[PDB]
Amino acid sequence: GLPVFITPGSGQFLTTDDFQSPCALPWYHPTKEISIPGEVKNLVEICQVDSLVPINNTDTYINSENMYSVVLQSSINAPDKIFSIRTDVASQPLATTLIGEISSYFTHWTGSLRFSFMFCGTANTTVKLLLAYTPPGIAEPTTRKDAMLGTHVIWDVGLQSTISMVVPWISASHYRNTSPGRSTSGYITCWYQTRLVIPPQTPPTARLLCFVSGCKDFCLRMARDTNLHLQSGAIAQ
Amino acid sequence: GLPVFITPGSGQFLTTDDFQSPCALPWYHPTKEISIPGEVKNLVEICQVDSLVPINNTDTYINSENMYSVVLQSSINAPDKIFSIRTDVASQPLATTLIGEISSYFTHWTGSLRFSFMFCGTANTTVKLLLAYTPPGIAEPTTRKDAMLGTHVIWDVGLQSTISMVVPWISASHYRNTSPGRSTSGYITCWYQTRLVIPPQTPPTARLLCFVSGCKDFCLRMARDTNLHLQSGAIAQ
Amino acid sequence: GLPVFITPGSGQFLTTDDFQSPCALPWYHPTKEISIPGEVKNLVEICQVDSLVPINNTDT
Amino acid sequence: LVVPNINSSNPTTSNSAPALDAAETGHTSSVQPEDVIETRYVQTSQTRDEMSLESFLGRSGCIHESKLEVTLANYNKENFTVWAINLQEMAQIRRKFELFTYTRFDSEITLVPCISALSQDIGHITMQYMYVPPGAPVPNSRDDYAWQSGTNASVFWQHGQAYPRFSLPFLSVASAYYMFYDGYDEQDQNYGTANTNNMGSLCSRIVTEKHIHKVHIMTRIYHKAKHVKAWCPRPPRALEYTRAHRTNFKIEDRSIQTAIVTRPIITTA
Amino acid sequence: LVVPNINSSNPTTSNSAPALDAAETGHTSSVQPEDVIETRYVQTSQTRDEMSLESFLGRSGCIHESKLEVTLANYNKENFTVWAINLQEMAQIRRKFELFTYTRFDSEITLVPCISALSQDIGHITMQYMYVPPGAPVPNSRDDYAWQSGTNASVFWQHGQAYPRFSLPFLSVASAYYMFYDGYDEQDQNYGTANTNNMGSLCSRIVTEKHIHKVHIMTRIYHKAKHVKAWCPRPPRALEYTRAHRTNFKIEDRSIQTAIVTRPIITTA
Amino acid sequence: AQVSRQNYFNINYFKDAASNGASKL
Amino acid sequence: AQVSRQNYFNINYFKDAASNGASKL
Amino acid sequence: AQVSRQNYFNINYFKDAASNGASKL
Amino acid sequence: AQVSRQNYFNINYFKDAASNGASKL
Amino acid sequence: AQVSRQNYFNINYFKDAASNGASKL
Amino acid sequence: RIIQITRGDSTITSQDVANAIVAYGVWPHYLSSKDASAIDKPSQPDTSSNRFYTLRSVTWSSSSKGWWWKLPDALKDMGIFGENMFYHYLGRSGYTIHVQCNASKFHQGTLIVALIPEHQIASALHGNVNVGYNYTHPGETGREVKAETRLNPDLQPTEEYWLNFDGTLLGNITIFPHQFINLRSNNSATIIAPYVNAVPMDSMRSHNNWSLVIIPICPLETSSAINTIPITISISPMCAEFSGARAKRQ
Ligand SMILES: CCCCCCCCCCCC(=O)O
Ligand SMILES: CCCCCCCCCCCC(=O)O
């Protein structure tokens, strides 16, 4: 027959290969497809949906709904820091959000992150906050002055209870690793720009919710297994 | 299926083969290319750049910058030999130059060599030198008369401090081995044509630098591993 | 991939075979040919040249 | 599949605040970099192919490890295995598919049979793997008549042979597989996907007749989805799995442990 | 790729001295044979293809020798290997790539697994090689769940099988690999390419279940660059290498020894 | 037939579609 | 397609370019 | 020749019809 | 070339006629 | 291409001429 | 022989050049949007940062073995350029390096002036040691080959100037953009260099792109009483761009 020459690699099983193989059920006709709402075609569709960041991840609020909100105080009359988080998509606390979870199935990422905040106080409660993003190469800011020297938004909480801020892609390389070592993409810090003011007979504190999702910008590459889930034993049948 | 006939050689691993193989990261999209100055496409580009020949390779000057220069003397009033070297690209002392190092990754060579010299004495110091190339088949010259009977250049060191001389390809065969046995491509010898003359109160000696590179002529073939580098042990991680 | 069927003879080494095989020195360019008088193309050219017959092949 | 370019942006002083919205609506914000900062014009060049479902799910992963310990004493009585097929017993694969409520795809199955020598030699070993759809007779011994495979599909592997592989078309009686099922039996029992996901069994036997070498044969089964479609994304599993077909997560004498790591103070990143 | 022809040349008596120049300028001389001697017309016929980067770097060379000594005592606890991938541990390959400051290419990896028999027989041995990108869980034992390879790429080899081989696309997050890096950590540590060249690990395990034959498996890994590009040539390494990712050359109680050979007198070639 | 890639050759060799390789995006 | 050589047959069989053989000079 | 399927490539390689694969319906 | 049978594909792969298969009747 | 013989099929599969089979006379 | 280079509000003249070298044949230019990664507008200070900065002079004597400086490190303290370098995460710049050294027609000596990309220095000692951040960041002072006892030496770079400080032979250093200053012919060397990196912009504090190495290949000799002469370096950033502004890094 046709003289052939066998090439290295022949006969191996590479789990990410793409070859054809004989069908064990010849002539079988599968069930017709019907219309089911909600089809997903690409994982980026999930990365673009907002999910709550467990910003209050301390031992006190840890296995409850409280890890998802921060409490603002009317008794504070100072430019205090309210909270901060690293900007790396798969770092804690972002890691367990939708976008952090999908990012953990890949090795590199790029793009801008959209952070949104929802103020949940009374309709008569007001406040102005400073939301700031500090590009890398420096320690996270400990004073409002140092924070505002970076990218920031001054949020007036009045009739709209929500705001969105974008952390732009500012990196030397086009992509970054989802597992960062001694590396950072920066920080997001929140500060009192003015004060949480309330009229008489109104609760003196109010909560804030923080969401994250990726922009049109966002992209992930090099699929890998996630470090965010385990199997330490058999799964019973 | 298609009747085929397996050919000898099948299944072997030849390190210099050229076959396709499945990609382990399907669909992966690599980082875009950006403009980086200095692209190299062919090793000959390196062979064509001048590098200093460690012409003074004696135990005295050996691990220093002095192995790269020769000292001329005003006290010599005679047609003395200043230095000499074999012309074989990978022989010592040429071996560790850029062109000698690249040549040591190949088995055969051909082409002309360009040798350049730079006089580093005072602007008031002068001299005329005889640079000569002796084709093979004879012992290296021991007298200026025998040297000049070959290919040569008489260099007047005046206002230009540099000169280039070309050692032409003169060989029976079209190529020569980079590892020569009982063989030579000839010699380059340097002699006082006149004398190193200086005015009063000027240093009585002056240095000379020698460079080598290949001409448009130059070509190497049959890639092989270099004899100019070793690994006698593990490289620590 | 393409369904194939292995034929008897496969994998054998027949010294008078005629197959292609990978080159161990890829991209290598051999020395140009120069003119050398006396090229022979076929053994019959030699058979057609006279040579002396050792007709007196005795021990003496 | 291209990611859009980052356009040039300028200093705005306006009445429309694109940064301001209401998330109460259940809609995700539409703010892009250009709305919040004076953006630079960058020509992004990223394909999104690797993030497609085909790419994400189209990778072979282990779904079952079948161990056959060959007994020489009752050679025909035993020496066969039975496994009710499912994608619920190995975590890595299970978690990826459970990111969706319904999935539909063809399956590529690759087998990796490994013979463990427990005697001086292994002789000649041949295995038979038969797919038994629900209702077909399940083998009861190494020499059961069901191994005749008159109509079921069987695949044979012998020592020395490359890894077996074959495809299966989408198998459900429904239009998609149920990754989750908020329902029961016709008898008000078995809450979950145990009802919906009955794909029959994969049975195997050592075909070689009685011999004198003890061996164990471990065949790992790998599954890769092809020509994939999925609907209704779900949050990823946050805890270890404990059972097949059930979302149960409680473990005895052990606290709930998620992948969230705590920190002392929330004002330090 | 053609080398130019040597043209005919005649005796010149002129005011322009092509042989005379100034190398102070940092420019290499342009003198060809015809400028210095009465040259003969020769029709050169040499291609320069073999001197191309593709040809020079496009050859398979050993970059790692992975030794797995199978222990029968704690069979599942050990029997796996981990190696942080890099081209710095074997001299021949390292020196060739370090002739450039930045390189960019796809990689072809060929594996040469050799089983060393330490018992009467070797039975049936099967190996699994898995590529673990940075961040993915690294296996901790032979039976780690990470070997399920739900999404990482794994390749299997069994005794009798031809040499495995597969390609990897250019892997960096940058536009080229750094062969050298005059920089540090974000913490002012780890000077060198240790920062820039983090490609993850190559892990392997013997897949066959517990058996009774002691064996050692040495898998040598060969790497060949394909579709190569390189920038900014550098002088070749002149001394033995001592560490990965560092240009250090000092060895304890040993003098610096280059490949230059000394001679007694410089007036004798 | 021939297809471009992120040019290569490709045809189906089996009669059942389940046998085919990965889908084109 | 067919290419000349320093004539031979050559086509790509895989969908990813990294799989291809040595580059043409 | 090429055939559609419930498109793929198919030709007969042997000289006796008994050698052929399953019949087209 | 293609031949009918008591249709199939057939070409010679070797340079010597003795190598060919059975003769056509 | 196809060649006559003392007809058969033949093409070169490698990029270096040294790889080719015996020369045509 | 005559050069005049005008940069910001600065002009260099040299009546004895070996005309200027443009490293790798590429003239410096601002980063193109096609190669860009970061998405914010880069600040371009122009004439306030793209001007000549003269560093502290070094003395060339008969026993000198060599010196090196690293860029952008050498300019970290230089006016507006230095400021931008630390207020921004990312920076990018090309340079015009003008090395000046005059003597007399009765002096002889030769310097090699090389600009090396990614000059990863070797450490002084054997064993598991690496070069400490402080030692590859000497500032405008640069580093001079002194062969004689320094500190925490397990953190020091090598002094083997003839091995290019990195295990390759001086002598082949000519493969890098370079010029010679041979006293009988010239009194300056000028190298114009574009930005060279595998990323479009980078951290200037963490990564030095170019290393400027100066080595006396032929010693300074003269019968004049003026037997040591200085070597002065003036460097002008070109097309400097910065991005990722925030507080100043200390
Ligand atoms: C015969 C080899 C095994 C074939 C396995 C493919 C079946 C997937 C069914 C998915 C339903 C589920 O278990 O949740
Ligand atoms: C999975 C098999 C190993 C793949 C090795 C290719 C990676 C080359 C990275 C070059 C950077 C360096 O180590 O200097």
CSV table of C-alpha atoms in Angstrom, one decimal, chain A residues 2-161:
chain,number,residue,atom,x,y,z
A,2,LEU,CA,0.9,3.7,0.3
A,3,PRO,CA,4.3,4.0,1.9
A,4,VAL,CA,4.0,5.9,5.1
A,5,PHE,CA,6.4,7.2,7.8
A,6,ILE,CA,5.4,7.2,11.5
A,7,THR,CA,6.0,10.4,13.3
A,8,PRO,CA,6.9,11.0,16.9
A,9,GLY,CA,3.9,11.7,19.1
A,10,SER,CA,2.0,8.8,17.4
A,11,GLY,CA,-0.1,6.7,19.6
A,12,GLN,CA,0.0,9.1,22.6
A,13,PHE,CA,-3.1,10.4,24.4
A,14,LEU,CA,-2.9,14.2,24.8
A,15,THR,CA,-6.0,15.3,26.8
A,16,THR,CA,-6.2,18.6,24.9
A,17,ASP,CA,-6.0,16.9,21.4
A,18,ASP,CA,-8.7,17.3,18.7
A,19,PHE,CA,-9.2,14.2,16.6
A,20,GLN,CA,-12.1,12.3,15.2
A,21,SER,CA,-13.1,8.8,16.5
A,22,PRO,CA,-15.6,6.2,15.6
A,23,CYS,CA,-19.1,6.5,17.0
A,24,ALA,CA,-20.2,3.6,19.2
A,25,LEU,CA,-23.9,4.1,18.3
A,26,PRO,CA,-24.1,4.2,14.5
A,27,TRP,CA,-27.2,5.7,12.9
A,28,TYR,CA,-28.4,7.0,16.2
A,29,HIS,CA,-30.5,10.2,15.9
A,30,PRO,CA,-30.5,12.5,18.9
A,31,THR,CA,-33.4,14.3,20.4
A,32,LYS,CA,-34.3,17.5,18.5
A,33,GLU,CA,-33.2,20.7,20.1
A,34,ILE,CA,-36.0,22.9,21.5
A,35,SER,CA,-35.8,26.5,22.5
A,36,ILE,CA,-34.4,27.1,25.9
A,37,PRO,CA,-33.9,30.7,27.0
A,38,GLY,CA,-30.5,31.6,28.5
A,39,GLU,CA,-28.0,30.1,26.2
A,40,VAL,CA,-24.3,30.9,27.0
A,41,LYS,CA,-21.7,30.8,24.2
A,42,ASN,CA,-18.6,32.2,25.9
A,43,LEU,CA,-17.4,32.4,29.4
A,44,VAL,CA,-16.8,36.2,29.1
A,45,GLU,CA,-20.6,36.6,29.3
A,46,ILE,CA,-20.4,35.4,32.9
A,47,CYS,CA,-17.4,37.6,33.7
A,48,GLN,CA,-19.5,40.6,32.6
A,49,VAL,CA,-22.2,40.1,35.2
A,50,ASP,CA,-21.9,41.9,38.5
A,51,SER,CA,-21.5,39.9,41.7
A,52,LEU,CA,-21.0,41.0,45.2
A,53,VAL,CA,-17.4,41.2,46.6
A,54,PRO,CA,-17.1,39.7,50.1
A,55,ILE,CA,-15.3,42.9,51.1
A,56,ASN,CA,-15.8,42.3,54.9
A,57,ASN,CA,-13.9,39.1,55.1
A,58,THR,CA,-12.9,39.0,58.7
A,59,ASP,CA,-13.4,36.2,61.2
A,60,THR,CA,-16.3,38.0,62.7
A,61,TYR,CA,-18.5,38.1,59.5
A,62,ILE,CA,-17.1,35.2,57.7
A,63,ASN,CA,-19.8,32.6,57.2
A,64,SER,CA,-22.8,34.9,56.8
A,65,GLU,CA,-24.3,37.6,54.7
A,66,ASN,CA,-22.3,40.2,56.6
A,67,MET,CA,-19.1,39.6,54.8
A,68,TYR,CA,-20.8,41.4,51.9
A,69,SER,CA,-21.4,44.8,53.3
A,70,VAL,CA,-19.4,47.6,55.1
A,71,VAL,CA,-20.9,49.8,57.7
A,72,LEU,CA,-20.5,53.6,57.5
A,73,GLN,CA,-20.7,55.7,60.6
A,74,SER,CA,-22.1,59.1,61.3
A,75,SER,CA,-20.0,59.5,64.4
A,76,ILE,CA,-16.9,59.7,62.3
A,77,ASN,CA,-16.1,63.3,61.4
A,78,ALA,CA,-12.7,62.7,59.7
A,79,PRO,CA,-11.1,61.6,56.3
A,80,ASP,CA,-10.8,58.0,57.4
A,81,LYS,CA,-10.2,54.9,55.3
A,82,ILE,CA,-13.3,52.7,55.1
A,83,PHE,CA,-11.9,49.7,53.3
A,84,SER,CA,-9.4,48.6,50.7
A,85,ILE,CA,-8.8,45.6,48.4
A,86,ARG,CA,-6.2,44.5,46.0
A,87,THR,CA,-7.2,44.8,42.4
A,88,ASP,CA,-5.8,41.5,41.2
A,89,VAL,CA,-8.9,39.5,39.8
A,90,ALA,CA,-8.1,36.3,41.5
A,91,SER,CA,-6.6,37.6,44.7
A,92,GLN,CA,-8.6,37.6,47.9
A,93,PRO,CA,-11.4,38.8,48.5
A,94,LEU,CA,-12.2,39.1,44.8
A,95,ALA,CA,-11.3,35.4,44.2
A,96,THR,CA,-14.7,33.9,44.9
A,97,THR,CA,-16.8,36.4,42.9
A,98,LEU,CA,-18.0,35.3,39.4
A,99,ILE,CA,-15.3,37.0,37.6
A,100,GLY,CA,-12.7,35.8,40.1
A,101,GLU,CA,-13.9,32.3,39.9
A,102,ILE,CA,-13.8,32.2,36.1
A,103,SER,CA,-10.4,33.9,36.1
A,104,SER,CA,-9.1,31.1,38.3
A,105,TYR,CA,-9.6,28.7,35.4
A,106,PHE,CA,-7.1,30.7,33.3
A,107,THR,CA,-3.5,31.8,33.7
A,108,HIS,CA,-3.4,35.2,32.2
A,109,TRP,CA,-5.8,38.1,32.2
A,110,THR,CA,-6.1,41.6,30.8
A,111,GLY,CA,-8.7,44.4,30.7
A,112,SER,CA,-10.6,46.8,32.9
A,113,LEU,CA,-12.6,46.1,35.9
A,114,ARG,CA,-15.9,47.8,36.7
A,115,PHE,CA,-16.6,48.3,40.4
A,116,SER,CA,-20.0,49.4,41.5
A,117,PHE,CA,-21.3,50.5,44.9
A,118,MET,CA,-24.8,50.7,46.3
A,119,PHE,CA,-25.6,52.8,49.3
A,120,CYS,CA,-28.3,51.2,51.5
A,121,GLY,CA,-29.0,53.9,54.0
A,122,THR,CA,-32.2,55.8,54.6
A,123,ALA,CA,-33.6,58.0,51.8
A,124,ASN,CA,-32.8,60.9,54.2
A,125,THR,CA,-29.2,59.9,54.8
A,126,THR,CA,-26.4,61.5,52.8
A,127,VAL,CA,-22.7,61.2,52.3
A,128,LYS,CA,-19.9,61.9,49.8
A,129,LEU,CA,-17.2,59.2,49.4
A,130,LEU,CA,-13.9,59.1,47.7
A,131,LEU,CA,-13.3,55.9,45.7
A,132,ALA,CA,-9.7,55.6,44.5
A,133,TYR,CA,-7.5,53.3,42.5
A,134,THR,CA,-3.8,53.4,43.2
A,135,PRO,CA,-1.7,52.1,40.2
A,136,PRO,CA,1.1,49.7,41.3
A,137,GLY,CA,4.7,50.3,42.3
A,138,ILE,CA,3.8,51.9,45.6
A,139,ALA,CA,2.4,50.9,48.9
A,140,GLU,CA,-1.4,51.1,49.4
A,141,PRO,CA,-2.3,54.7,50.6
A,142,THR,CA,-2.8,55.4,54.3
A,143,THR,CA,-4.1,58.9,53.9
A,144,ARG,CA,-6.8,60.5,51.8
A,145,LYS,CA,-4.3,62.8,50.3
A,146,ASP,CA,-2.1,60.0,49.0
A,147,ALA,CA,-5.1,58.1,47.7
A,148,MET,CA,-6.7,61.0,45.8
A,149,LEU,CA,-3.4,61.6,43.9
A,150,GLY,CA,-4.4,58.5,41.9
A,151,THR,CA,-7.4,57.6,39.7
A,152,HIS,CA,-10.5,58.4,41.6
A,153,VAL,CA,-14.2,59.2,41.7
A,154,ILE,CA,-16.0,61.5,44.2
A,155,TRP,CA,-19.4,59.9,44.8
A,156,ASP,CA,-22.3,62.1,45.9
A,157,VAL,CA,-24.9,59.8,47.5
A,158,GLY,CA,-28.1,61.6,46.9
A,159,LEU,CA,-31.1,60.3,44.9
A,160,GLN,CA,-29.2,57.6,42.9
A,161,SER,CA,-27.9,55.0,45.2
